[model samples]
Target: LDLTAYFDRINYRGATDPTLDVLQDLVTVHSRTIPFENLDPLLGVPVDDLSPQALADKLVLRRRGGYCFEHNGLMGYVLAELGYRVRRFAARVVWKLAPDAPLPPQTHTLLGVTFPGSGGCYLVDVGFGGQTPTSPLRLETGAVQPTTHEPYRLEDRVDGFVLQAMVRDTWQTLYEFTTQTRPQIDLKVASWYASTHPASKFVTGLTAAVITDDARWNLSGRDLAVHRAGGTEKIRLADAAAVVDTLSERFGINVADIGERGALETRIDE
Candidate 1:
């Protein structure tokens, strides 16, 4: 893995102590810089192989972003390379699932990081797309933690835990998970469904996100929304050129030469 490339992508030059502060800063910088994008799925691009080198090529070297499997896959790898204790957890993204479908697959990946000599584990995520927190949340059950963008809390469950985010005065469940270490086969199956399945949102819809200190800039289809505490200001792009340009200019992603721009035009017209 090109460790230098990944760090440069995020513009991180902080202490690499593997402590909580370093962990927090890394997560914050990663979230703010490396946007969450589903262009690969939309463009029929394959992301089944998530090796550190492969991820660095697509995400860092290319200055692009990706969905959960791609985002969390690389996050865990980078943390491990930095000498932090990390583990992967599969999650069912109930928040985005169909209401009629009660039991869903573990299609989400989250990182479990333990500070050296500390018994408490922290939940660090940077690939949740538009709704991703701006910082890491301590894995302390029932404690409401404030991130750079939102207030999140976790509820204990028999299997693992349920994470929730407060939105407009309501505690909405974000996702549910279990800590049973998954095998590579499990990730393979999840990646198949996420990257290729027709029903997967990442395949059918267009979404991207980049964070600022005060707001989250997001794009869904042809609409762009800047979400903040004051209010959400939205705009509908006029054409395909606008879509590609916004992604590059506003989201800090370079998509001018990518086939996803043509795909985005088709999706917008649909």
Candidate 2:
């Protein structure tokens, strides 16, 4: 694989070693550059069942963006292909948005990678929304670790584990995870819930976008928001047709031929 091309596509200009340091950098670069978007559902493109081949085809071949399933799955493939000891784990959304929610059978996906001689594994993710960690977290500790964006910690639980993010000295639950082995069917269920649930934010009105340090960009429905190292900028999109054009022109997503303009416009209306 031309790893440099991937990095260049995301505008990642960090060290390429497969060590923990490089892994951290790559995850950060990936999260910040490639946005976690559900534009496929909003644009009427079917959310296919999660499989390694489908994920690879969507990300590597089709040159598109996806929510956690596609992003994390493809990321796992890349890390493994690049020679990391990567394993998949399942998690439930426990953030403030879904605090009272019970753990779905397979609600989320995360990766655990063992670095050589590290004596323990590290929690690596590049697909969580909003306040995602910009670096991998040491799985053995509840101690706060500094990341590019904020402070994060992982606490082991009897049932699973709790990931917390620190904001202004307060702890917030990012997600709770179990070490259970998940198959493709599990992710399909989760993706279905996320795309179809009435309470899912992705189903309702939402706009998200990201840009790399080098200016490569990805935006959710419409050209509504832009996030960067400094702060966020919100703008008004002209219409749904304009949104489709922007997605293709700016983010390299091809939804125009898929007959998704009406759905994209409805999202903007909401």
Candidate 3:
């Protein structure tokens, strides 16, 4: 449970107390350094297990990144070990899809941190891929807050809430979630589907994002999008080599042994 290696992995040099400040600093550092990716599913690797040691091995030791299950799962373990009263919630992700389109299981994981006495509860997440939050969002509605990269707000709904991000001038909905705590086994089920389902976008060799204060680099098959303050630019990566190099050089990821990078092109519009 020691985070000595994890600290070095994210290059964190901040307070280590079980406080809100430490949580904010730690999530910010993690979003930038660790990246949100599905390379294991992309590289023919099986990630059915989401143990702390396994996640630590891949994220901290191998320096690789994974999707929400891996990112939030690892963070959940780290926070639990640090003596934080953490509550895990599974959310029905509907970023771009229609809300009433028959929700397909819980696809996202977020944290509710009940800080030490008088510290208050906060929403902690660093696994939204390209839109990963750089700081903890207060679990309150109607208040707009700024992360390290973008301004975010949580809009109240009848059932739950909608997470939105201000991209340029547009305030776009990111996802919908409730505060209901979920069992550990539920996440495992969702992770298995995300990593193994044929219709899953993750294993389709598409979609990867790395967050930083300056910019957010995303990859969807041949399309590589670099989003910064002023604007965003999308370029096509010709081959797997280019994609590998881009992920390594730009996102600080090392997902070598990549196969066909354009395999997801035909299925992208699905």
Candidate 4:
């Protein structure tokens, strides 16, 4: 693999350390630059149940994006290749937007890494859409851990640990997770559901992007929302063609034809 190319694409030009600092920078850069997109399914591209090598070919070589399985799975491989102790775990995301809803059984994949002498593991994620953690969070609880973008705290719950982000002095549950060993096949099952389920927003939504500290640039169908962090300045796009262009130019996502744009336009008109 061309390490330089991948690092450049993610805009990571910092010192290479497998410590928490570098790990956080890597996740922040990746999440902000490379969007977690499912445009392949909409464009008739084959989504295969392959190993990391095949996934790299599809995403890195073919220049396409995927959901958590493809995005986080490849990230695990890259971290391992960089000599980090990475393990894959299955997690059920408790949607903060709908907290009362029961978590879908193993709907997400999380990476756990053990630093050489840190004694405990750290959670590293490059997927989970807009509100994903922008850095590695320590496995231990009770202490506040500041990430590159936000302040997150993991606390002990009765059943499992809860990941919460500080939003306007209130704690928001991002997701709940346990240390269950998850095989790759398990993730494939959830990934399949995400791509095929009628209730899945990904199946119908035409938007995807990463959030930053100052602004959030998201593509929703053909319209784009660039929102500033302070809630002061916001830019909205109404042109479908311009949205597609921004997806390619800003996020490095290349759409093959106007079908994807049309998909966004149709959703916007709804």
Candidate 5:
């Protein structure tokens, strides 16, 4: 891993010692800089290569963004490279599902980081799109932990740990995850489904998001929304070109890598 390049990607010049404080700072900077985007899947490009070199080339060198698997995969590798203990986990997303809806497959990725001696575990995620936590939350249940954006809490349940966040003064269930540590192949299968399955949103829709110090900028198709403490402002882009402009300007994604720009624009307009 080119630790220097990753740091450069996020504009992070903080201490490199693998302490919890440094971990928090790194998460904050990384979440804000590297956006969550699905351009590859939307353009029929499969995100099957999750190796360190592949991730760095696409995300860091190419200046592109990706979904949960790519984001967490890169982060896990970077953390381990910095001498931090990192474990990967899969999650079933229920973020916008009906209460009685059928359970979804494990398509989401998150990481668990443990301190060297104290063994303090933390939930570090940087790929959850608009709801990505800007700070590491303690891996404890029934605690309403405060992140840099929204207040999140994890509940102990028979299924697994239910992650919820306070959004618009209402609590919303994000996903449920288990303690079982998963191998890279497990995440590879999940990423395949997410990036290639016809029914997956990443394959059929366009979405991009990034976090700032006070707000979240989210782009769903041609609708761009900025959610801030002051309020939420949404703007509808004039056309596919406008949407592309927003993707380049706001999301920090290099639209030139999208070889089929016209096809992507048509898909986004659809």
Candidate 6:
């Protein structure tokens, strides 16, 4: 993978030293530049490739958006390349699920990054879409950690560590994960299910998000939400074409990157 190209793609000209500040800036810039989307999976294409080159090709070279697996995969690879210690973990996402809903399988990918003398491994995720933590959250519980977007905290529970975000004064559960490092083989299997399984949201739903310095932009099907400190402003695109246009104009995604663009637009309109 080309570090220079990746850095350029994210517009990151910060220091390359493996420091906590660099990690935070990298997460912020990368998340804002490379949006979170699932066009391939939504169009019946499986996201089976977790290799660095494949991720760099799609997310960096093509300027297409991707979900957690692809986002964290590329981020982890980039961090390692920059001389940071990065560990991959699988998370069972419960965001927006009913209180009594059955626990879902591990479908989310997160990274734990450690600097040489930082002494704390931070939970750095640039892949959680609109609610993605905009900074590296230190691995500490109870204290509400402030990020570039919102406040978040991790809780140690009987099941595992729970990642929570404080939204509108309420703490919402985002996902649960353990520190046990997941191998690439396991991520491949999970990505297969997440991208191809009929029941997976990526297969049935349309969603995209890009977090900026002041606001968070999210697209769910035809609905678009712009969230900032003031409040959230919502709008719905008129048709599939509008959605496609918004994805390109607002989210900074190359809508033409998807090979099945025609099929995807049709499915969106349908």
**Candidate with the greatest TM-score versus the true structure:** 6
Pick by TM-score: 2 or 5, better one: 5
lDDT of 3: 0.79
Model 1: CA > 4 A from native = 96-99, 257-270
Decreasing TM-score order of the candidates? 6, 5, 1, 3, 4, 2
lDDT of each: 0.82, 0.68, 0.79, 0.71, 0.88, 0.91
State the local distance difference test value for candidate 6. 0.91
lDDT of 2 by residue, 1-270 (tens): 455556675677766556888787778667655666676665445465676677756665556667777788878877877778887887877677654656544557888887667658888877776566677888865787887766798887887788998755588888889766676677777778777776666666444444454232445555555455455676667866677666666555655434555655555555
Which scores greater on TM-score, model 3 or model 6? 6
Report RMSD for candidate 4. Answer: 3.2
Q: Using lDDT as the measure, which candidate wins?
A: 6
Better of 2 and 6 by lDDT: 6
Q: TM-scores of all models?
A: 0.92, 0.77, 0.90, 0.84, 0.95, 0.97
lDDT of 4 by residue, 127-231 (tens): 776667787888889899887666789889877787888765788887777876677777777777777666666666665776675755666666556655464
**Residue 106 in model 2: lDDT:** 55
How well does candidate 5 score on lDDT at residue 24? Answer: 87
Which lDDT tens digits does candidate 5 get at residues 1-270? Answer: 798999999999989988888898998888888889998898788998999999999889989988998999999999999888999989998998897988898999899998676357898889889987788888888878888788999899996798898889988999989978999898999999999999999998888999999998999888899999877999888988799878888888888787666655766666
For candidate 6, write residues 161-228 as lDDT tens digits.
99999888889999999999999999999999999999988999899999999999999989999999
Candidate 6: regions farther than 4 A off = 259-264
